[PDB]
Amino acid sequence: MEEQIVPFYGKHQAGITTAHQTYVYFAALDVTAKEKSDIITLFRNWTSLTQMLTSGKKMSAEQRNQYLPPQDTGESADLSPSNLTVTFGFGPSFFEKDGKDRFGLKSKKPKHLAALPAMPNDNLDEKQGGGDICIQVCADDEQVAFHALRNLLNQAVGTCEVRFVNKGFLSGGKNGETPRNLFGFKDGTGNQSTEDDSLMNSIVWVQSGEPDWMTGGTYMAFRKIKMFLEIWDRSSLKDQEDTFGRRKSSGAPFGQKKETDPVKLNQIPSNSHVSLAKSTGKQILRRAFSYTEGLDPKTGYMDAGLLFISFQKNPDNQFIPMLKALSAKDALNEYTQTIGSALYACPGGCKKGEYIAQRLLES
Amino acid sequence: EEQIVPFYGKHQAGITTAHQTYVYFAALDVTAKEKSDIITLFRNWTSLTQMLTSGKKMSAEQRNQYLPPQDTGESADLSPSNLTVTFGFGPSFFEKDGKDRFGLKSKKPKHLAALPAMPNDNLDEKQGGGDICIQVCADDEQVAFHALRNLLNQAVGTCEVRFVNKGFLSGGKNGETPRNLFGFKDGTGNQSTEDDSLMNSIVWVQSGEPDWMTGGTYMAFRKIKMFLEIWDRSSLKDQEDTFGRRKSSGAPFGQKKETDPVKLNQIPSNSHVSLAKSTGKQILRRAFSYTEGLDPKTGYMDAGLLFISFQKNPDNQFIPMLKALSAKDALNEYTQTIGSALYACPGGCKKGEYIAQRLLES
Ligand code: HEM
Ligand code: HEM
Ligand SMILES: COc1ccc(CO)cc1OC
Ligand SMILES: [Cl-]
Ligand SMILES: [Cl-]
Numbered sequence: 001m002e003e004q005i006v007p008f009y010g011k012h013q014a015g016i017t018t019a020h021q022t023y024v025y026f027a028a029l030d031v032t033a034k035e036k037s038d039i040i041t042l043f044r045n046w047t048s049l050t051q052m053l054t055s056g057k058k059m060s061a062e063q064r065n066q067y068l069p070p071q072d073t074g075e076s077a078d079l080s081p082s083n084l085t086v087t088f089g090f091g092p093s094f095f096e097k098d099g100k101d102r103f104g105l106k107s108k109k110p111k112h113l114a115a116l117p118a119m120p121n122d123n124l125d126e127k128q129g130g131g132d133i134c135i136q137v138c139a140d141d142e143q144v145a146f147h148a149l150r151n152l153l154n155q156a157v158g159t160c161e162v163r164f165v166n167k168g169f170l171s172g173g174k175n176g177e178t179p180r181n182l183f184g185f186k187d188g189t190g191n192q193s194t195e196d197d198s199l200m201n202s203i204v205w206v207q208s209g210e211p212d213w214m215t216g217g218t219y220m221a222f223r224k225i226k227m228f229l230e231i232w233d234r235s236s237l238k239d240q241e242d243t244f245g246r247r248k249s250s251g252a253p254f255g256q257k258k259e260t261d262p263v264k265l266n267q268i269p270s271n272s273h274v275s276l277a278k279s280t281g282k283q284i285l286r287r288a289f290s291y292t293e294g295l296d297p298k299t300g301y302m303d304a305g306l307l308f309i310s311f312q313k314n315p316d317n318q319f320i321p322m323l324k325a326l327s328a329k330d331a332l333n334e335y336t337q338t339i340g341s342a343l344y345a346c347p348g349g350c351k352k353g354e355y356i357a358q359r360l361l362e363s
Numbered sequence: 364e365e366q367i368v369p370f371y372g373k374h375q376a377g378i379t380t381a382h383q384t385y386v387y388f389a390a391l392d393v394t395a396k397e398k399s400d401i402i403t404l405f406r407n408w409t410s411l412t413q414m415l416t417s418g419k420k421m422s423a424e425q426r427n428q429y430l431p432p433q434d435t436g437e438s439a440d441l442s443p444s445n446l447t448v449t450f451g452f453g454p455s456f457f458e459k460d461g462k463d464r465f466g467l468k469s470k471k472p473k474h475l476a477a478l479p480a481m482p483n484d485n486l487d488e489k490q491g492g493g494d495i496c497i498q499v500c501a502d503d504e505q506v507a508f509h510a511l512r513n514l515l516n517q518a519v520g521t522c523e524v525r526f527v528n529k530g531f532l533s534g535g536k537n538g539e540t541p542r543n544l545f546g547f548k549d550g551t552g553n554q555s556t557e558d559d560s561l562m563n564s565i566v567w568v569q570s571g572e573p574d575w576m577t578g579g580t581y582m583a584f585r586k587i588k589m590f591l592e593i594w595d596r597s598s599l600k601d602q603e604d605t606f607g608r609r610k611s612s613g614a615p616f617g618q619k620k621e622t623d624p625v626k627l628n629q630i631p632s633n634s635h636v637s638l639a640k641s642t643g644k645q646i647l648r649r650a651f652s653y654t655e656g657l658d659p660k661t662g663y664m665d666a667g668l669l670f671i672s673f674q675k676n677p678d679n680q681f682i683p684m685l686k687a688l689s690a691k692d693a694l695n696e697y698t699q700t701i702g703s704a705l706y707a708c709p710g711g712c713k714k715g716e717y718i719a720q721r722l723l724e725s
Contacts, residue, residue, distance in 0.1 A: 022503075022504075023504075061611060063599050066598065066599050066600040067598045067599075067600055068598055068599070069595060069596055069597060069598055069599065070546070070599050070602070070610070072546075073544075073546050073591075073595055074542065074546025074547075074610060074611075075542045075543070075544055075545075075546045075652075076542075077542065077546070077611070078534075078535030078536060078537070078539040078542065079533055079535070079536060080536045141384075141533050142384075142385075142504070142531040142533070143531055143532070143533040143652070144533070146531075146544075146654055150591065150595075150664065153664075154595055161662065162657060162662065162663075164656065164657060165654075165656050165657055165664065166656065167654065167656075169504040169505055169508075170505070171441055171503050171504070171505035171506070172440075173439075173440025173441065174440060174441060174442050175440070177440040180436065180437045180439065180440065181437065182435075182437055182508075183436075183437075184432070184435050184436020184437045184439070185436075229435075229512065233431060233435055233512075233516060234431055235431060236428065236429050236430060236431060237425050237428050237429075237430065237431070237432050238428040238429055240432070241428075248432070248436055249424065249436075249439070290505070292508055292527075292529065293655065293656065294526065294527050294528060294529075294655070295524060295526055295527055300523065300524065301524075302512070302515075302527065
């Protein structure tokens, strides 16, 4: 190809319809500062630095003063940009924490930004969820990704405490096949094409009915979903395919030849994952990554799962009904448990000369 | 190229092999009572490893829908990505709590013992040791994890998993020395892994050891937390002084290039490089950075180095360096060892033999 540089500036924030990279670092933060003007400072600086990290500009580093810290941590000096994207979102608690509109922003609050409803089978750790700000960092190289997060978080010392940092991977096939999750199934097929503007306009991107700063933005849902690999791996192929209602290998819906053939609902169990998701009639854009965090001390097996991230213009319409219908009855519940949860509103894109969330934080 | 690294040969791969980007590193404790069980394990591990590393896909559509799939499937569409798997054995494999469980004492390597305690250690016992270690490397995380997962699946009933760590280390886009999380080039001081004579002198067992160890080596493992927040707010002067090399160039102080010989008289004597180089000893370092979320005990990134090095004789090459460093290293300010192990790596496997056969007996 050419180079791996994804624009930072644009109508939309990168990292959403951007072709899905291999690695993610996913972080949520709380603001401890009390003035809005501290926040403007954080967003201005986050903006300058994201532009620089994603563009491929390297900091010269001829430090005028040996006695100060280097402005960059340096572990990416010799690395390509690797399609780095950084996407920012704001949780409900940014607009109103514990009854208080801390920053005078409750009137610019997005139409559908609220914590997700409790669902059956949830086993949420509150500290593994929520947050005032999320940063989603993606790249084709784990070290490029970590470097961007670390340097971004360094800038937030004084203003924000870091709540959690997750990270994940998902490898696409050598010839561009749909990437497989840890259950060994193709994961993404049902997404519409990220290159179809019409469909992305109708499924993902905010155009009306929200505060101006959300124009060209979207909502991001996050669910941290542990996957029980040892249970799954001991299951028959029949149980695996029936759980989803596609064939493992081909990815095709039952009774069909190809991955991309329409789902025949009447040929798949009612409570198969695909049946339940498709049957709400609604669409989202899933952009998830697998994770592993070593051994689970409470299990003695691998701690592994899915960092479920989806984008949608109206989560009340598009997402929560899906969540409701799967949480009750999904065959997949046999093999998974949700342990983290958040919904964030992601601002529209940054224009050159403005900063992220400006039309929110100003005037 | 084709991205295939031979599994069979004089040595195990993953030691002098070019450093891949990703690692998964596991240790297991044998729970089986009979050597014959361990023999089964090693046989399976062998044939499975050869498949995984070779580029061979299962690619034979399952008969009997009612059985578990033999492979977990998530590497079906991936390149083998230079995958290597390296096995080793800890002391407790040969003798646990003064009992020779599998009748192997008399085949025990000359230099295999738990590493001595050192100042500034804060070892978690459950984050080192183990009877067996598996080091899995590849240029793609998903490939490496798949390999580990399917190896470990085979071990169910024979072993319990002690711990699984994983990490990364990206080489420069033009083949520059990879940088660690402190942002310094990491590996300049190793000899060329392409020089058989040097590797023979430093890494590979040729004599003085049981036969199964011929072509093998010893693997030292040190899990070292790196306090990135402490380091990032340090001055550049302090960071360079910690090592005795310039961050950017990687040059020894007062020299022009990375490859230039260190001048000991030009670097601080408590500097990392001065202390290491001054034992006059040599090792082959093949380490990986790790990140493991927020450390709850500090609210900062939990991050570090999976220090891994290879040496024909640890008592001569490695234990000294450790001694030399542990009390005076400037790095002590920014790091803390929290896990430790030493393991003996069998010589390579021949086509038709299994790993550690000569130790186990066939
Ligand atoms: C560990 C958790 C999960 C796994 C392993 C998983 C896996 C899968 C797989 C294998 C498919 C079929 C291929 C595809 O179209 O991607 C699929 C489809 C889908 N999943 Fe999931 N999923 C998980 C959680 C969720 C959650 C929480 C949601 C929504 C709330 C969700 C929504 C969907 C949707 C909308 C589809 C597409 C249905 C259609 O064809 O229209 N998934 N998922
Ligand atoms: C977090 C822990 C560590 C870090 C970040 C680290 C980093 C470095 C760096 C930046 C260098 C100089 C460039 C190079 O030659 O690679 C170096 C050299 C070296 N380190 Fe370390 N190191 C660590 C732990 C250790 C330990 C535990 C040992 C052995 C006990 C060790 C042994 C050496 C040796 C032998 C050299 C080469 C000295 C020579 O030039 O001959 N390192 N290390
Ligand atoms: C890529 O060269 C290396 C760089 C770093 C290490 C770990 O210190 C090992 C290397 O090759 C054996
Ligand atoms: Cl059903
Ligand atoms: Cl590191």
